Design a protein around this ligand. Sequence first.
Ligand code: NA
Ligand code: NA
Ligand SMILES: [Zn+2]
Ligand SMILES: [Zn+2]
Length: 229
Amino acid sequence: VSKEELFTGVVPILVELDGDVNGHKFSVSGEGEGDATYGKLTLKFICTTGKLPVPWPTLVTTLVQCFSRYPDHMKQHDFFKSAMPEGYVQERTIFFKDDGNYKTRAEVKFEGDTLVNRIELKGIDFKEDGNILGHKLEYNYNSHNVYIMADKQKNGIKVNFKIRHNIEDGSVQLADHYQQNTPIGDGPVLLPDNHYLSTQSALSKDPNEKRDHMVLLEFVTAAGITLGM
Ligand code: NA
Ligand code: NA
Ligand SMILES: [Zn+2]
Ligand SMILES: [Zn+2]
């Protein structure tokens, strides 16, 4: 039921996102590679419609948890890989405290040797001069724990966590994330015991790139379950 064999080695990744936030329409493409044995991602994203209308860090969680490293004793809890190659739908609602929300739907699946994440994002209720549309977020990311449980009603998982976005005046903008994942295929999947992913992300710029872009490295390992339990 585990699909670890698809994830051997380095796997190319493609990402495509169409988004509309307070009627500002935009698109983002990304390409890179993942190594689930190490739990590491490297990707570069470009805004193909001009300047991104929201800050890049707000799109990090939207823009492939199947590349998480699952420990030796936790292979029976890896839902994300178990749903491949047909893949899973990942839906979120993200509430930015004192501001608007994003709602997202994505399909993550293999197209051949490439892992692809295809996303629609709709943003509503943002303040024109808030931290988001105001572009008051620093260009950086912090470490978070992403809590995963099995869905008690359907074949799938329920996931929640709270992202801290640091603001240029020293304050912090919180983004509460609520997430569900369901398989696309009707094959068996792994429905995990409660656990979490320890997430770290670092953002940078390619000094030669003139398009609006984001270079992103991530390291993710699952944790939280006692051997054999
Ligand atoms: Na199998
Ligand atoms: Na605007
Ligand atoms: Zn172990
Ligand atoms: Zn158990």
